Design a protein around this motif. Sequence first.
Motif, PDB file in Angstrom:
ATOM      1  N   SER A 103       2.793   1.521  -3.826  1.00 21.91           N
ATOM      2  CA  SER A 103       1.512   1.614  -4.849  1.00 21.91           C
ATOM      3  C   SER A 103       1.703   2.808  -5.693  1.00 21.91           C
ATOM      4  O   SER A 103       1.011   2.893  -6.562  1.00 21.91           O
ATOM      5  N   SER A 135      -2.555  -7.106  -5.110  1.00 27.54           N
ATOM      6  CA  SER A 135      -1.296  -7.253  -5.650  1.00 27.54           C
ATOM      7  C   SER A 135      -1.105  -8.750  -5.269  1.00 27.54           C
ATOM      8  O   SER A 135       0.014  -9.437  -6.136  1.00 27.54           O
ATOM      9  N   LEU A 173      -2.527   1.186  -8.388  1.00 24.20           N
ATOM     10  CA  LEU A 173      -3.330   0.952  -7.005  1.00 24.20           C
ATOM     11  C   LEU A 173      -2.678   2.228  -6.000  1.00 24.20           C
ATOM     12  O   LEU A 173      -2.955   1.983  -4.689  1.00 24.20           O
ATOM     13  N   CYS A 218      -5.492  -2.889  -1.352  1.00 19.60           N
ATOM     14  CA  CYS A 218      -4.188  -2.898  -2.021  1.00 19.60           C
ATOM     15  C   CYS A 218      -3.275  -3.802  -1.907  1.00 19.60           C
ATOM     16  O   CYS A 218      -2.477  -4.540  -2.860  1.00 19.60           O
ATOM     17  N   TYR A 272      -5.315   3.701  -3.569  1.00 20.71           N
ATOM     18  CA  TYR A 272      -5.385   2.893  -2.257  1.00 20.71           C
ATOM     19  C   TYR A 272      -4.139   3.351  -1.276  1.00 20.71           C
ATOM     20  O   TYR A 272      -4.789   3.706  -0.203  1.00 20.71           O
ATOM     21  N   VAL A 288       0.739  -1.119   0.026  1.00 20.98           N
ATOM     22  CA  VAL A 288       0.093  -0.061  -0.005  1.00 20.98           C
ATOM     23  C   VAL A 288       1.018   1.242  -0.042  1.00 20.98           C
ATOM     24  O   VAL A 288       0.361   2.378  -0.332  1.00 20.98           O
TER      25      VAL A 288
END
Lengths: 141, 39, 38, 741, 68, 160, 80, 139
Positions: free
Chosen positions: D650, D739, D655, D735, D658, D647
């Motif tokens: 990202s 992934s 993403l 997130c 997120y 996260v």
Amino acid sequence: DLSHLTPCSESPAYQAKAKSFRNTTSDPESGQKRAESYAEALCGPEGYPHLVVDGRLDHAGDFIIPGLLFLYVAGWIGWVGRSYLIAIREEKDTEMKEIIIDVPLAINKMLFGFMWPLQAFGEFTSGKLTVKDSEIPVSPR
Amino acid sequence: KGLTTFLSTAPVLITALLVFTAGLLIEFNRFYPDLLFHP
Amino acid sequence: ILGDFAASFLPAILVPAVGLVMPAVVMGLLFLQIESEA
Amino acid sequence: KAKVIVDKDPVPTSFEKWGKPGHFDRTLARGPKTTTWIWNLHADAHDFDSQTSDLEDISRKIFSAHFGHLAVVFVWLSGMYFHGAKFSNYSAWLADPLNIKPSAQVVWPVVGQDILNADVGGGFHGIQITSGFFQLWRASGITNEYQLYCTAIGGLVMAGLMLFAGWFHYHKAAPKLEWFQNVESMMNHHLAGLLGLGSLGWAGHQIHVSLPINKLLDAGVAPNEIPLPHEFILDPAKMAELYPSFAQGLTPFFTLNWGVYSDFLTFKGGLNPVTGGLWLSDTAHHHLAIAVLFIIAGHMYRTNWGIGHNMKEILEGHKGPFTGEGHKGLYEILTTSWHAQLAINLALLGSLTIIVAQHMYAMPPYPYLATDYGTQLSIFTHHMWIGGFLIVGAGAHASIFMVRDYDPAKNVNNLLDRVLRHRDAIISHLNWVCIWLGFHSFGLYIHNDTMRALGRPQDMFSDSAIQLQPVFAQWIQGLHAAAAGATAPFASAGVSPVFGGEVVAVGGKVAMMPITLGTADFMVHHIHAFTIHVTVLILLKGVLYSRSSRLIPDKAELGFRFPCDGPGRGGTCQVSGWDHVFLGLFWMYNSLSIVIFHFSWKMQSDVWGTVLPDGSVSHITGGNFAQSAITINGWLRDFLWAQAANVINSYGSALSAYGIMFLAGHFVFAFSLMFLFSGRGYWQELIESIVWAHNKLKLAPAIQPRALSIVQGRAVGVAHYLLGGIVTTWAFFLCRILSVG
Amino acid sequence: AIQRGSKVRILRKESYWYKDVGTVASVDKSGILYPVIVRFDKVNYNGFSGSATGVNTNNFAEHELEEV
Amino acid sequence: IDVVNHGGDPQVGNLSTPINGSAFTKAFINALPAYRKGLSPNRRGLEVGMAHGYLLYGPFAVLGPLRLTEYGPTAGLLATIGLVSILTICLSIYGAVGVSKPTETLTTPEVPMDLATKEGWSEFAGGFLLGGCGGAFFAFFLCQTPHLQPLIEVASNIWS
Amino acid sequence: SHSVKIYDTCIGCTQCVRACPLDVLEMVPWDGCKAGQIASSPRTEDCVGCKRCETACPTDFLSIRVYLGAETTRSMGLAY
Amino acid sequence: IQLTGTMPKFGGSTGGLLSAADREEKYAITWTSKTEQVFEMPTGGAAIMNEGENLLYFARKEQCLALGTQLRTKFKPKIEDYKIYRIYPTGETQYLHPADGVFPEKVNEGREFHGKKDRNIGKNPEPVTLKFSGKTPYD
Ligand code: CLA
Ligand code: CLA
Ligand code: CLA
Ligand code: CLA
């Protein structure tokens, strides 16, 4: 003279980044337009544009032009708000059109709010901008 | 007649103002994107 | 584990005294002090 | 006894009250002298009991507001079907559901948010949705986007119909009070006519539409050569070439030869090996069975024809020695108070939503639901959060019932009176079990932190160390794994692969594995019980001590929602029933956060993962729940630090929204503590300093600026706290799982 | 000079409308300490928490006032 | 039939439930060392301390830093002695502050008058010391003399 | 015990006495008001300090004023 | 004195008298009613005002006046004839709430000035004047 800050065209870290500038809009060459538009700025060792804020010219576009533009717009907003607030005082029912905004008065305040610094200077020199310290509520010490 | 008073309330007008301002900014950053400084 | 410093047996006595014995003494004495009447 | 009687045109439809805010309250109608009027306008907008004292008008307002809420929900559902129809890759997803991610929202390219359009497959760029709408439409037999467009149009028509019904039932033909008191007819028409007929119609749809379309989908037929569901009905030959017991008619249903319907009404139990979902024959048989059961249950209560129960003699007959008088007065409580009904219904709906969450992960009802880990994690987390919010709202409305709708004259020596009479014995033993659960659920983690820190791995509470094996749950798991063929002799497999069996795997990823329970599962289940118990303690303490206490005996006259009684008696801060809901919101945050953390770690470490060609399962984290979920440092390091690597890295990717929402939730959580920690008298004095600076430049507002009230300060703080924490956990979960999944 | 309807400024330091101007509703002629009832446009802080209403009048003395 | 009554006085904040005061909890609480009719202090304390010292050689003997070591039972005995000594110091300072007459409830309508004085609570504390030491040493001797005693194998296989 | 002090800016509206939950306050005759009465606090040893009397006072600053002082078993409002 | 009264028909609760009621002080409220009705105790739950005169005991004065407010307001027979006493464990009874026989919100002669300041609340001495003395600025 900011020798640590090189122009982005002469900087060899900005040219590596400027190939991979992503498109922001639906325009396909938007990354190339950003790359050519940011080349007149100053880039550090990272390869990213820097803004110099000291009021000098050839860097006035970083702060002086956006600052003066914001000062005009914020003075517009504040002066139209103060004009509406003053205009709705002396008519004996002020909370109801404080909560439910009188649109025909607000439009006439807004569209004639372009001349806010002239009216601000007139109220400043006339003394009708600032309330005297006698005629104002003050908390106990 | 009572509908225009409701549209003249503070939340309806502040929502109309914020949508108009956000739309103006969004339409400006679409046609003229990536303005970090004045050239 | 005893140390290479001089008088290594003194941590084995003072640390349980300052960590167990005298805090028990101080809490008992302060309890009698703060809970006694008159 | 149960008849339709209405008043014709009780409220005229005019816009004159639209321009007069605060019309519903007498105190709000004097005008906005202070800014507290603005917040009181929204705090008391839906509190219909404080507006009018007549229960008939309150019930009319509630009945007409339900239609507007249903119209809002139908607008939402039609918007989701329209996004599936127009801005989705559902037709692309139906061709290859194992390598194309579900996406139903494109992002407009005005700024650099065009990066938020993830590459999900099939030449489509958009946001990878995790709502599970795509798997729901595949289980519904929807093959093309035109069937989603028709459902969106129908949702708009139904939303307009609900808006017209809400206007009709408040301004043209509004029912009387006794149209609401006959809950016998209401419950008969909600059991048989709403749940029973609804599940019967869905059973018929799953017989005629979902089953043939899904069997052709699993057989390997592309969806645009799959026939539309209406020629399955118009031409029964195509419907009878697969599942060939449609060759015979409906007569085996009517001669009770139900067994020949066993080809399409199965009780297989397990998961489909092709899709990873439940067998749709099992779901159709399930809906038919519960439809018959609900229709039978909807003939229980006496409405107009003598047969049935009256829900009062059932209550009158239920009385014992430990209670005495029994349930007398409870029918009048539940037929005169809307808040007691809301407290019951909201608690059962919250526990129901939690049951939905705990069931859809273990028995995934939809094709390719367990394969997409993001959908499963998101629906589990979403339904836990919704369920806990509804349970805390049930505690809230029980507290509102106790001071505003409870009458001691109707309640003498019944169950409610005796609960009020021994509320000290209730709350003190609940307090003891909360303290015991806190010590022997969290001090195990503290002890494990200490012994892992002090280099004592043999002194811990671990599987290698002192064991704490959950022998009752393991015994129940052994009972469920052996249930098929022994205690359920006509089930092909167990209800779920959780309790035992083999690894159900679809594609290359695991649908479901057995979930072995060890010391870490024991310890985290005791933390679950602890946090649930403390939430129960705060909410039930707010309920029982809502009217009176040893501190403030005259607390019912102060109301449900008041800040305090004063700094006296030591300081009676947060004594109200509202403030117990305010604290119970923090404790449901804590409880459900630990629940979804246990889920997101246990499934990632021991269930989810890929299948090696040798046969072994390589999980997402690597089975570290056995040794790291016993320590707080293990939960911090191997779960919060390790899985938030996605996260925070990202940015500059698909993403990155997120990561933005992760930081935004951190901001809102920190922003909450300004309202939570401070008090009103600081901010009133600061606003007093600002008022003079406005007075200096003729900027005095007509509506005088006040600080937020103490209850509103607590409400703003808890709403920001929950919003910032929940947005943070949503961003982290989504997130991570977009992934690694 | 203090009469009903005359706009008057408050000289009580602790009052909410210290150095603010309000109208006179009534003046009492009996021997009481605070005979001048003064009503204001703004409202006081008075009331419970969350109350949208507040008082806007109070009794004042002669020396606690000045006529504008 | 109301099995849950009050104690005879409804406005006192207690209820005479089956668990609280019915027939089997009035006895066996009035017949415990505390609340028994004929016992003096230094006999109530002796019985209470003996029971406590005996039960407390269960989470120290098989649950400790030395529980895998042959010194484990001895360390558990020493820990039980230390806990009994700390509890005796607590009882002694509780008495030395000054005690009131103990709370009379529905289960115990008569409380020991001999524990309402500082001198009685000193005898109770001394009896608790002697009883705790005796009970801890007796449990140590019983656990140590067969040297395995496979009842200790139970609840140490659980507490592995 | 708390100190409930009543000042001379009292209109005799009796709202403090009706707002008082422990009968601390009462009305005595008073020649200095239009209502002919002022609040008094005789049994102020029963004052818990809830300031409901200060809440109900309609004066610009409150004529009745509670000062939280020494804490007793009645100021704490303890049933135990 | 000696409190002749019968107790309302109450099932017994846990919010009533604790151990300090028989050791420090307890409170009582006696009231006469001409009808039998249902009231809510501050203790918890509901009890029965039996016909005639009633006597209840509470641990606090606030519980007794919370009962007395329920006896005055919210009842159609409008019971005002209630008397509140304090019982110490020695046996002494102090009659407390209607001392003059009239409610405190109604003015009565014979009551003296308690806590009355003949000064404005803004006209209070500064604490710096009253440093290092037992006097506080509200004296
Ligand atoms: C007519 C409107 C107006 C005007 C001109 C002022 C002007 C002033 N305010 Mg501000 N303020 C206002 C509204 C206004 N404010 C409102 C609505 C709020 C509540 C959010 C505040 C809360 C407030 C704070 C907390 C502070 C100021 C401060 C100040 C000063 C510095 C400017 C500043 O910090 O801006 C800050 C402005 C805001 C935080 C919010 C402004 C909101 C908009 C822009 C106001 C105009 C829109 C209005 C709602 C509608 C216009 C009417 C229309 C129908 C015609 C200046 C005297 C500071 C001060 O005392 O400095 C001496 C100070 O600390 N103000
Ligand atoms: C804030 C409210 C909220 C939000 C926004 C959503 C949104 C979501 N829910 Mg959800 N839900 C909630 C509250 C919420 N729900 C509550 C309160 C319940 C308890 C009744 C449920 C139970 C529920 C189930 C059972 C399922 C969803 C699913 C869905 C997802 C797809 C929506 C859809 O079309 O499903 C359409 C789904 C259905 C029509 C099946 C529901 C049929 C149920 C079993 C019958 C309920 C009848 C009646 C309304 C309840 C009576 C209660 C009874 C005790 C009297 C989506 C993430 C679905 C999902 O996760 O798919 C991936 C799914 O299957 N939800
Ligand atoms: C079936 C559901 C249901 C129903 C209809 C009721 C009904 C009602 N509730 Mg509620 N309640 C429920 C669920 C329910 N509630 C739940 C789930 C909670 C737990 C949180 C509670 C907790 C509760 C309390 C604590 C109280 C009520 C009260 C109220 C009454 C008036 C509500 C009002 O006007 O406030 C309208 C207020 C709002 C709409 C503000 C809500 C602001 C939220 C936090 C924002 C929404 C979150 C959103 C996603 C954030 C996006 C941010 C973005 C926009 C930037 C009314 C009886 C009040 C009452 O009766 O007072 C006497 C009362 O004080 N409720
Ligand atoms: C980490 C943060 C934290 C901690 C430690 C606590 C602690 C507590 N909360 Mg909680 N709570 C918190 C934050 C916290 N809360 C916040 C954010 C709020 C939300 C507004 C509240 C509001 C709140 C309410 C509303 C309630 C509690 C209650 C409780 C208690 C639950 C009983 C329990 O578990 O006892 C066991 C104690 C623990 C698990 C804490 C760890 C202690 C370890 C295990 C033992 C170590 C002791 C050590 C050996 C002593 C020797 C050291 C020596 C030097 C002194 C407990 C004392 C409830 C309560 O008191 O009723 C039971 C309750 O009603 N909480």
